[PDB]
Design a protein around this ligand. Structure first.
Ligand SMILES: [K+]
Ligand SMILES: [K+]
Lengths: 470, 472
């Protein structure tokens, strides 16, 4: 009735008996052609878009023309960041695997819902089985399981929610009746989704007690021990320790076995935030760096980062999946909505499973090796240059470094590194990020793009030398 | 390393064109496969024909043929809301542009975490949500963020309400000596209880207000409960009204409930996850009267605006509240606020692309027409029920949702639940018609959600003929 009417475009929906197949096929092909053109041509667009500024938006009364829509897609693509450019080396945001793109097409077309088994009969079972398999690569044991979540922040929130619920039995009565303030410990280098989660969970941001990190940005276990004693002495109630496997700024890995041993000694939930570094489970050569992770009560891991799955794709894993029934699920197989922060949720398992199959464990082991190799080339270039300083030793394919030119007052180093970052981008078409770290602005390389080469790295250093020598 | 033996030729799209031909062919095969399933969706039943073994992640790359067969299997094993007989849930066939929008989003793979990771999309999302906040009538300060589902939008609205009432961003709420509570209809969404658990309030902090026979919140009982809460030494801080209850699709009286919230100094949140779409219908939008005074609104285009999941938002009448009462005191190099700092999520998929493309292609007039046709089908179901003395309506309808059940006099009330389950199974197996069967009022009820643009009077007629045959 609506679709026959003059108030809907003939291609607004796909007629399920094929009546508008030809019109629908031509519209789809125009969008597919445009996208393939932009992506097979991605190196023609710089890593960051040229500056334009947009006016107030209006939602039209009448249907837009296919022309207007295609032009909108064109402008949206041209105005977006372009991590497919070999020069894009700044963030844990990679070009997507081909199958990941196609898996989201497939997911959106069937439009199933992870909320319940009846709404995702194929997908729910697959996600549950795949995450058991992944939990097994982490060595979490037979009872281990998890859920997919829209982002690592939600995975951290859910881990901390469970750790809180187990410590305080807070599912039904909440935590406002408490005389001792609950607190958690994390490296001073750990992700701010811990503070955001602590605020959301009613613990407040201050409940995340920072633990000293070494010169190489790894948590100091002796300091963790100190801070736990201090918390107890102050009448606080520690309930969780978060170790990070791949810190956001520097990509370093905490000493997971030692941290875990301290958490267990003190009866604290041990959560490992392996959002980035968890991908090392696919590399024989580098997997040892995660040693201790197998004793975690929970793990956060984001395939959208180092496994090249188009955003979002992240999970939280529990060593005992049964805990979600005990200390999460509200009073009322298992409909996944009941045991996640989200209810309705897009079927990320489609792009995850298709991606994992097409690249394979050996494929990831090779991508990971090549990331390390580029990273080590950056480290060597920094070592050859007295005016550059490394943040510290690297644990992953991330290198944080900055200029500390001795001919400049330190008060002007932030300006110097900001200027270098802008120049690398403008003239070298190379994007580094510029995080705040240790109270200063540092440059940050994340060597993820499979098409970044040694030549790009040598090119960056050449322009750095030219900038340094004015 | 693409040059290596260890990765398929098409694992990634070479940014200088080197595998363009191979990538095009692979992409074309999946596109053609998906179009056949969707242009052929009426041949697949609304639900798949009826356990898988443990999964193994393969060492070596899978063949393109294995991958294609996986897609075929996954689709054939999926629910199929595109079937005209799928009429059971708030889960629609996706608009064509929403499918294509997600294709575009995944291809450029930007991140809504921050402006520099989503330079065009972050500004577009902020401006579009101001525009939508304006349609809801929230005023010039109104703004919002997209979220992955309405549960997160409800979570975020209730976090902000709690933070404003208790100054809890930094110290938390463990210090409190009177328990914070919220009020909501006994018909309201369970994401309130889940949100309450997450926020540290406990599931019991959601105090249920009596609803009428038509499943609408009773403003008099809300007042009683607020009085009772304060007498019991609780601290009310928020009232949630629901515009479109999940089971029956009813709309709370937003103006009266909001008057009562404002009278008692409580945050007024409207969960318009479903019914919010009425903002695009001149003819039905009056049903939301009072919503314009809300402190916050949850709205889910993935429901009645046909945007492929997920797509939802939380809107605030004063978007500055997010800076004041949400954002943490404080990885990247205008003054614009990175959206990750003012949402529950940090990294987020660019849902704005399918939303904006869909809104433009359907337009306000298209939605008004879609909504009308939904009310027409629902009214046809209501009429069918009225004619059959063995069927009972749950109550008056407010949206395109109809909850009803068999209560046949010739069977004892104790057997009604099994009668209705068996009818639901029958409609599905014989009729190829899917109705959901929620628990409501301690009973099993049938539930029709009349969303598919291709559901016709004839589908409804067939459902009633199967019901008649079953009852005879
Ligand atoms: K150096
Ligand atoms: K009747």
């Amino acid at each position: 009735n609506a679709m026959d009417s003059r108030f809907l475009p003939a291609t607004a929906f796909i007629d399920p008996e094929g009546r508008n197949r030809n019109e629908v096929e031509r519209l789809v092909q125009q969008v597919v052609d445009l996208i393939l053109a932009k992506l097979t041509g991605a190196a023609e667009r710089p890593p960051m878009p040229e500056t334009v500024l947009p006016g107030p938006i209006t939602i039209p009364e009448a249907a837009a023309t296919e022309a207007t829509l295609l032009q909108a897609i064109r402008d949206m693509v041209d105005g977006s960041m372009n991590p497919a450019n070999p020069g894009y080396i700044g963030h844990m945001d990679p070009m997507p695997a081909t199958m990941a793109i196609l898996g989201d097409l497939v997911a959106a077309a069937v439009n199933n819902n992870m909320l319940s088994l009846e709404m995702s009969p194929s997908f729910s079972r697959l996600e549950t089985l795949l995450l058991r398999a992944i939990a097994g690569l982490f060595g979490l044991g037979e009872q281990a399981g998890g859920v997919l979540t829209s982002g690592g922040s939600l995975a951290n929130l859910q881990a901390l929610a469970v750790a809180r619920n187990v410590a305080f039995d807070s599912v039904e009565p909440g935590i406002t009746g408490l005389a001792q303030r609950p607190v958690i410990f994390a490296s001073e280098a750990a992700h701010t989704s811990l503070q955001k989660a602590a605020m959301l969970l009613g613990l407040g941001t201050a409940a995340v007690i920072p633990v000293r990190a070494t010169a190489d940005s790894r948590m100091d276990p002796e300091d963790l021990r100190a801070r736990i004693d201090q918390a107890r002495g102050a009448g606080q109630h520690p309930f969780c320790v978060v170790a990070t496997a791949g810190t956001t700024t520097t990509g370093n890995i905490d000493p997971l076995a030692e941290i875990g041993a301290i958490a267990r000694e003190h009866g604290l939930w041990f959560h490992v935030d392996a959002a980035y570094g968890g991908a090392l489970v696919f590399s024989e050569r580098h997997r040892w760096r995660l040693a201790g992770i197998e004793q975690a009560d929970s793990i956060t891991f984001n395939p959208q980062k180092w496994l090249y799955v188009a955003k979002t794709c992240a999970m939280v894993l529990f060593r005992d999946a049964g805990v979600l029934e005990r200390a999460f699920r509200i009073p009322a197989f298992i409909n996944l909505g009941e045991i996640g922060v989200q209810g309705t949720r897009h079927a990320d398992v489609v792009k995850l499973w298709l991606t994992l199959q097409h690249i394979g464990q050996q494929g990831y082991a090779r991508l990971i090796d090549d990331g390390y190799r580029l990273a080590e080339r950056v480290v060597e270039g920094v070592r050859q240059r007295p005016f550059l300083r490394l943040a510290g030793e690297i644990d992953t394919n991330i290198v944080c470094f900055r200029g500390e030119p001795d001919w400049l007052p330190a008060e002007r180093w932030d300006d110097w590194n900001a200027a270098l970052q802008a120049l690398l981008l403008r003239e070298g078409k190379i994007f580094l990020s510029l995080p705040v770290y240790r109270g200063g602005r540092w440059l940050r390389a994340v060597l993820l793009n499979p098409y970044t080469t040694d030549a790009v790295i040598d090119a960056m250093f050449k322009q750095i030398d030219r900038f340094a020598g004015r």
